[PDB]
Amino acid sequence: KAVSDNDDMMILVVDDHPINRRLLADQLGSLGYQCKTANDGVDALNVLSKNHIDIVLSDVNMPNMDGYRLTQRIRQLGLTLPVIGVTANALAEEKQRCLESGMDSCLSKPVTLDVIKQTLTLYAERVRKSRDS
């Protein structure tokens, strides 16, 4: 005689752009997943340290500081989950991921609903395998 909803899929939405953050969280909301909003590369792992998250999506378009090191800090914390680094023109975003060695994948700033859907679906199955057994 009750409900035991928990959302199940707690996703981390980080963006360095307010307009992109809005739309990224909006898309996640219509997906039906918990949207944890953040604003920085370091904020991603900070939020991860405060609360548990399944999928990390940190979008950085500013190649002035991060889009790089934050993934170092994540590997320093000890990533047991996929860090998807959404990036836009950070010179060599993939190279930053390799250097700091704490990501998982790299995407582009314009993450649309459809793009988000296939990525979330694919990664939902992946984390199901990474967490179970």
From Swiss-Prot:
Superkingdom in the source lineage: Bacteria
Domain Response regulatory: 10-124
PTM annotation: Autophosphorylated. Activation probably requires a transfer of a phosphate group from a His in the transmitter domain to an Asp in the receiver domain.
Positions of post-translational 4-aspartylphosphate modification: D59
Subcellular location: Cell inner membrane
Subunit structure: Interacts with RcsD.
Function: Component of the Rcs signaling system, which controls transcription of numerous genes. RcsC functions as a membrane-associated protein kinase that phosphorylates RcsD in response to environmental signals. The phosphoryl group is then transferred to the response regulator RcsB. Involved in regulation of K30 capsular polysaccharide synthesis.
Recorded family membership: Belongs to the RcsC family.
Protein name in UniProt: Sensor histidine kinase RcsC
Species in which this protein is naturally found: Escherichia coli
Source organism phylogeny: Bacteria, Pseudomonadati, Pseudomonadota, Gammaproteobacteria, Enterobacterales
Whole sequence portion shown: 817 to 949 of 949
